């Protein structure tokens, strides 16, 4: 709650929303600390920095229901039914009901979220958690053995908003997930206070926010193609200055050409002049 660059209100909104709803999606562009919030946040909700409770995974298009929950895979002797992580993870929290166990899914947008989750796409809802709503799995040999989400389990979803796929839209999953936007937060003092507590110049910081925000506003100008979801995150500035190199315009000049320019190219594709303009605008 000290080194975080996002407002206290949003996290205060989140914790009540998470505790009530038990499922959330933190959606924003890359470089806004989606991972760091969730890792920090789970430790807040547990109240202790216990990593065994928390497990993180990063989805990808080839990820499958075989990997996540159950699946048939080979031992040394031959093939067997291999309990996937979430079945293994829910058992871990099922062992200890009192504590809050957390599961984080990164790059969620890429995969067919329905495909992987499958049976739990119904069960994950906060009300339908318990033995009453248990169901036999696909690969379960007998109907009697079933799987039910425990009440303590909470799920957090981290989604990149800059690569929309107009392939499958599911509004039913959207019912399961309470969606929370995250702004980059250049305007926030907490981001600035970190840098001003890193021997930054006061003008250098203030002019920078003016520079980045104008770029961010242009990206949000044309809502159809791009939006707030595409706009630039801050996290590039966090790393690389803890060595001891104090802020300077030279330091920024590295990041602009190193990092932002391909992003600009990606976004403002087949428009070099706009890249030259917005690239050069920042440097001055």
């Amino acid at each position: 709650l000290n080194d975080l660059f996002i407002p206290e209100t949003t996290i205060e909104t989140i914790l009540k929303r998470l505790t009530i709803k038990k499922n959330i999606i933190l959606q924003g562009p890359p470089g806004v600390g989606k991972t760091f919030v969730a890792r920090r946040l789970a430790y807040l909700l547990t109240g202790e920095k216990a990593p065994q409770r928390v497990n993180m995974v990063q989805f990808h298009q080839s990820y499958s229901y075989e990997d996540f929950i159950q699946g048939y895979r080979p031992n040394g002797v031959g093939f067997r039914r291999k309990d996937g992580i979430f079945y293994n993870f829910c058992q871990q929290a099922k062992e200890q009901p009192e504590k809050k166990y957390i599961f984080i899914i990164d790059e969620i947008n890429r995969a067919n979220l329905s495909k992987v989750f499958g049976e739990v796409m119904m069960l994950m809802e906060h009300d339908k958690r318990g033995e009453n709503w248990s169901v036999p799995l696909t690969y379960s040999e007998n109907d009697e053995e079933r799987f039910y989400v425990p009440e303590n389990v909470y799920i957090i979803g981290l989604m990149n908003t800059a690569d929309r796929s107009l392939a499958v839209v599911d509004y039913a999953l959207r019912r399961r997930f309470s969606f929370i936007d995250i702004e980059p937060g250049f305007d926030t003092p907490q981001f600035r206070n970190f840098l001003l507590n890193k021997k930054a110049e006061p003008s250098f910081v203030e002019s920078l926010c003016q520079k980045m925000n104008e770029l961010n506003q242009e990206i949000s100008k044309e809502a159809t193609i791009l939006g707030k979801g595409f706009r630039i995150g801050h996290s590039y500035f966090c790393c690389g200055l803890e060595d001891g190199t104090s802020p300077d315009t030279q330091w920024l000049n590295e990041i602009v050409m190193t990092d932002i320019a391909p992003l600009l190219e990606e976004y403002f594709f087949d428009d070099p002049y706009k890249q030259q303009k917005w690239t050069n605008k920042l440097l001055g």
Partner: protein, 336 residues
Amino acid sequence: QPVIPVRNIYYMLTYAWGYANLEAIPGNNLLDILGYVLNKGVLQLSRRGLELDYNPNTEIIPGIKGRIEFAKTIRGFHLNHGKTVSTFDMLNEDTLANRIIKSTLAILIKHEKLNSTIRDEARSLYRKLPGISTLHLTPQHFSYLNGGKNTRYYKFVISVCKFIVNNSIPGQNKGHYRFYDFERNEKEMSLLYQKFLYEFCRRELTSANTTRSYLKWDASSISDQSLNLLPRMETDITIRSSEKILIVDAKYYKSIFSREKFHSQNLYQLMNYLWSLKPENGENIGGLLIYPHVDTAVKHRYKINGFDIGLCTVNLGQEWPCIHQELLDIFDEYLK
């Protein structure tokens, strides 16, 4: 060089394909209109959801997925390195219909003469469909999709995709494309007109029955019963009602656009259609000649050889609703 405003053709194409605001776009030329339909059309689909067809997949994996093929497994000895050849149904959007959309969008961007915003917006869409694979389009691809399993909405945009590719010509550069001057050629514009009416009449003239009718010569020849050499005769349209039948022949000519001599060579075809056609009902027989004109519309009637025949025109370029009103006004006179 007078021609129709480009926007109105799209309405005729719609009935030609048998199934929106065009005032917003400022580009009068066709490809600006046509792309904006598609560029919005793709986005309209994604809201509802694009077609996902279960493609069975037989592949070599380290475990059981779906149905294992015992034969290919033992023959390749894949058990030993912990693998099986199994059949399962991955669900993709990589179908022929969706691949065509993505390939069409590549062509649309490459067109040298196009609104910049249209080109900008489409390039987003191409990126937004990563799973789909680009393809080199041919009519044979569209031929395979004549089955028409797809939804009613898909068939509209695909019809657009058919129009664009056929009416695309490389221009200044090897990569880029340049749009065909569709308006200038009479035959394709004329063939549009004949098909435009046939599907149009089914919509509005619920009162009458609208069918294309094949006709047979009254002739007999000692040489051949086939009479293959004789011209094949198939009506453009027949619009039959209980009180009166009516045959229409419609064509697009450049000479008529000039307000002089008249090009009515098509009339020569018409009488033989009236002659070869014999009605069992015997209520009446009437004929109509209808052409497109730009400025104004004029209607005449004739009593030629015991037949009641009309030559008439429509003032394309006025406005679509009054044109729709005008056509209903037209058929109302003669169908009586």
